[PDB]
Design an enzyme around this catalytic site. Structure first.
Site, PDB file in Angstrom:
ATOM      1  CG  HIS A 137      41.287  47.107  48.304  1.00  0.00           C
ATOM      2  ND1 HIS A 137      42.334  47.994  48.168  1.00  0.00           N
ATOM      3  CD2 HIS A 137      41.813  45.977  48.837  1.00  0.00           C
ATOM      4  CE1 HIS A 137      43.443  47.431  48.617  1.00  0.00           C
ATOM      5  NE2 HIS A 137      43.159  46.203  49.011  1.00  0.00           N
ATOM      6  CG  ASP A 174      45.734  46.617  54.276  1.00  0.00           C
ATOM      7  OD1 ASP A 174      44.989  45.753  54.844  1.00  0.00           O
ATOM      8  OD2 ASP A 174      46.258  46.457  53.136  1.00  0.00           O
ATOM      9  CG  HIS A 176      46.926  45.087  49.553  1.00  0.00           C
ATOM     10  ND1 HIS A 176      46.874  44.180  50.586  1.00  0.00           N
ATOM     11  CD2 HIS A 176      47.336  44.391  48.465  1.00  0.00           C
ATOM     12  CE1 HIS A 176      47.252  42.992  50.152  1.00  0.00           C
ATOM     13  NE2 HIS A 176      47.535  43.090  48.865  1.00  0.00           N
TER      14      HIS A 176
HETATM   15  C1  LIG Z   1      41.715  43.673  52.452  1.00  0.00           C
HETATM   16  C2  LIG Z   1      42.950  43.230  51.682  1.00  0.00           C
HETATM   17  O1  LIG Z   1      44.010  43.320  52.181  1.00  0.00           O
HETATM   18  N1  LIG Z   1      42.825  42.730  50.334  1.00  0.00           N
HETATM   19  C3  LIG Z   1      43.959  42.291  49.543  1.00  0.00           C
HETATM   20  C4  LIG Z   1      43.453  41.881  48.159  1.00  0.00           C
HETATM   21  C5  LIG Z   1      44.459  40.964  47.491  1.00  0.00           C
HETATM   22  C6  LIG Z   1      44.204  40.756  45.996  1.00  0.00           C
HETATM   23  N2  LIG Z   1      45.343  40.037  45.443  1.00  0.00           N
HETATM   24  C7  LIG Z   1      45.346  40.020  43.991  1.00  0.00           C
HETATM   25  C8  LIG Z   1      46.418  39.023  43.529  1.00  0.00           C
HETATM   26  C9  LIG Z   1      46.935  39.336  42.129  1.00  0.00           C
HETATM   27  N3  LIG Z   1      47.380  38.124  41.465  1.00  0.00           N
HETATM   28  K   LIG Z   2      47.658  51.195  53.066  1.00  0.00           K
HETATM   29 ZN   LIG Z   3      45.724  44.658  52.586  1.00  0.00          ZN
END
Ligand SMILES: CC(=O)NCCCCNCCCN
Ligand SMILES: [K+]
Ligand SMILES: [Zn+2]
Ligand SMILES: [K+]
Ligand code: NA
Length: 640
Positions: A137, A174, A176
């Protein structure tokens, strides 16, 4: 020439954490690292890996992907108290800081660079870095989503600069979207970025319009960004494999990368509170396995996210098991991707049809809490491959291959079988063939001693008949038969125990849905055509059929691709494959045993386009078979 799997890990990276209450961040914990390393130790995997120490990324290395302003700001966080750390954290989206996190971020980044050097220097075949914080990210001047510096971006840029690589593939599985990686390589055609991600029509974090399938890269990079959004939760093994066979793998084998980097987040696994997907830990054994023929096996797996401590540990193990060449687990209950996944897949393929040969036929009308079972134990075979060259021929074998030696019990079994089914057959050696076939099958089936094997034979029909029948009454419920050749085998496909793939030169029509008959036109077309069929037709059906044994058969009269098939087909039946080569060819037998033994596969080179006639033949196959074998689908089906 390279051997081994690097495992790069350090406890120091577990020595930062969240210091104030924040439900958005509270899932990212030091125990992610320790639970994963502990599971690798528990299952004997860490001890089988080469431990490579971690190092700090240098400031010049950080500057490959980040701005001096950002770096300078992060460099100040070691001196901040908790009040200043919270205020610094709040300048970014979903990220916390800690006095040690700059140090650990430099470690996570250096750990990745250590992995790239170990693989590119041929000190190991492949490897995995277990690192905190994650990276994918983070962006040029911002921390984002638990990420400080973009570990995987570093790896690609470092690999381009220090090894003059022109083609790097980054697979981000992943759950995300790795927007930091997308932004970094947006305009760069030398890095192909693929990501699937929970999206839900942009309602899932990070809520970006450019995470949709429409973002294909920019300028000279158009077509080297591939986004596959998941627009519902609960994606399954079938959804994931459908994404690989019908989007990722066709593009990856066409791109022909010189290095593969995996952004390996396991928040895409069952039980994860962020992903809410339904894929089993075992699927990562196959995701890993299906990419390993690429770049001669040069594969750097880098940990990203994953927040269910149980499914994270199991998924990490499944990955390292596959990096070590251990046999893949059998995946049961596969079928069609759901409608939402099929919509994503068809939209991606259509938008990428401008850029990729595997999709070009799409552009023209003429063309077209929860609990789950603990994974079973994956056991490297005592000897992997047994080989039976013709009598008199000894050959150089890898340290994990052996020659056969018919036991008296088997010799009687061959006598019984001749007494009943073959009277007027007395050739002493095409009856040693059957003693070879039966003895090698028993080692494969009856013990974890042997995994697979190859036998050279003379009379195809008696050899195939005895192999298949001895397989079915061992018993192995189902047998996938892969035949390159033109005859009609003594194979019955009218009971559901056998699926027959046949790659032949004479055009045939098959009548029933347990046969797949591919007749490709010979020429410089042949290789891209075959690989298209392998990835888009053969593997989908094979995975759904889920055989307990694979029977490969090659008649004395392609080839270039045979090692890729042999490698890829070992995802089925825990790698138990018996190859029957009719007539001695030194190099085909040598290639077969190489790939059966788990050695690196030589790259094919970037693929040209297949003949449109071959694509047509293959899509007609798809239309004919996808009602029965839904994993073939790469479109939403028509509703009544
Ligand atoms: C490395 C990784 O997988 N990061 C995930 C980050 C999650 C952020 N969540 C935001 C929640 C919104 N309410
Ligand atoms: K991904
Ligand atoms: Zn993730
Ligand atoms: K790119
Ligand atoms: Na925040």
């Amino acid at each position: 020439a390279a051997s081994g799997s690097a495992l790069i890990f350090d406890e120091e990276m577990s020595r930062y954490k969240l210091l104030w209450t924040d439900p958005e961040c509270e899932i990212e914990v030091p125990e992610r690292l320790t639970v994963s390393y502990e599971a690798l130790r528990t299952h004997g995997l860490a001890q089988r890996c080469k431990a490579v120490p971690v190092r700090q990324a240098t400031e010049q290395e950080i500057l490959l992907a980040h701005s001096e302003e950002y770096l300078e700001a992060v460099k100040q966080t070691p001196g901040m108290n908790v009040e200043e750390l919270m205020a610094f954290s709040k300048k970014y989206n979903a990220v916390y800081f800690h006095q040690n996190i700059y140090h650990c971020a430099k470690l996570a980044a250096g750990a990745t660079l250590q992995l790239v050097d170990s693989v590119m220097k041929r000190e190991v075949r492949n490897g995995m870095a277990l690192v905190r914080p994650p990276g994918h990210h983070s962006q040029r001047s911002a921390a984002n989503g638990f990420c400080v510096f973009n570990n995987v971006a570093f790896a690609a840029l470092y690999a381009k600069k220090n090894y003059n690589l022109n083609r790097i593939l980054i697979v981000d599985w992943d759950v995300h979207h790795g927007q930091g990686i997308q932004y970094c390589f947006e305009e760069d055609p030398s890095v192909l970025y693929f990501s699937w991600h929970r999206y839900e029509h942009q309602s899932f974090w990070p809520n970006l319009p450019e995470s949709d399938y429409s973002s294909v890269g920019k300028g000279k990079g158009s077509g080297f960004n591939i986004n596959l959004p998941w627009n519902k939760v609960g994606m399954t093994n079938s959804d994931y494999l459908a994404a690989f066979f019908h989007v990722l793998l066709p593009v990856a084998y066409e791109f022909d990368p010189e290095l593969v980097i995996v952004s390996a987040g396991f928040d895409s696994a069952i039980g994860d509170p962020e992903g809410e997907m339904c894929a089993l830990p075992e699927i990562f054994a196959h995701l890993t396995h299906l990419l390993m023929p690429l770049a001669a096996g040069k594969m750097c797996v880098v940990l990203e996210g994953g927040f269910n401590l149980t499914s994270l540990g199991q998924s990490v193990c499944q990955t390292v098991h596959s990096l070590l060449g251990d046999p893949t687990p059998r995946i049961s209950g596969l079928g069609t991707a759901c409608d939402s996944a099929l919509e994503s897949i068809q939209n991606v393929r259509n938008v990428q049809s401008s850029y990729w040969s595997s999709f070009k036929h799409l552009a023209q009308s003429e063309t077209n809490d929860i609990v789950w079972p603990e994974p079973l134990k994956r056991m490297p075979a005592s000897v992997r491959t047994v080989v039976v060259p013709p009598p008199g021929v000894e050959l150089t074998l890898p340290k994990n291959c052996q020659h056969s030696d018919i036991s008296e019990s088997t010799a009687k079994e061959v006598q019984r079988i001749r007494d009943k089914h073959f009277h007027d057959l007395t050739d002493q050696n095409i009856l040693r063939s059957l003693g070879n076939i039966i003895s090698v099958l028993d080692r494969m089936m009856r013990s974890d001693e042997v995994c697979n094997g190859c036998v050279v034979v003379s009379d195809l029909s008696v050899s195939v008949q005895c192999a298949l029948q001895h397989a079915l009454t061992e018993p192995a419920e189902r047998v996938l038969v892969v035949y390159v050749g033109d005859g009609e085998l003594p194979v019955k496909t009218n009971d559901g125990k056998v699926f027959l793939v046949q790659i032949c030169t004479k055009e045939t029509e098959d009548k029933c849905v347990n046969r797949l008959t591919l007749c490709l036109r010979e020429g410089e077309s042949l290789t891209a055509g075959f690989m298209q069929a392998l990835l888009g037709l053969i593997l989908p059906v094979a995975y759904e059929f889920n055989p307990a044994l694979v029977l490969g058969i090659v008649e004395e009269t392609l080839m270039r691709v045979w090692g890729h098939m042999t490698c890829l087909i070992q995802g089925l039946a825990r790698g138990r494959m018996l190859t029957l080569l009719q007539g001695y060819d030194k190099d085909l037998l040598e290639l077969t045993v190489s790939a059966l033994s788990g050695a690196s596969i030589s790259p094919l080179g970037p693929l040209r386009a297949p003949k449109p006639e071959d694509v047509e033949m293959m899509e007609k196959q798809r239309q004919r078979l996808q009602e029965r074998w839904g994993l073939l689908r790469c479109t939403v089906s028509e509703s009544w």
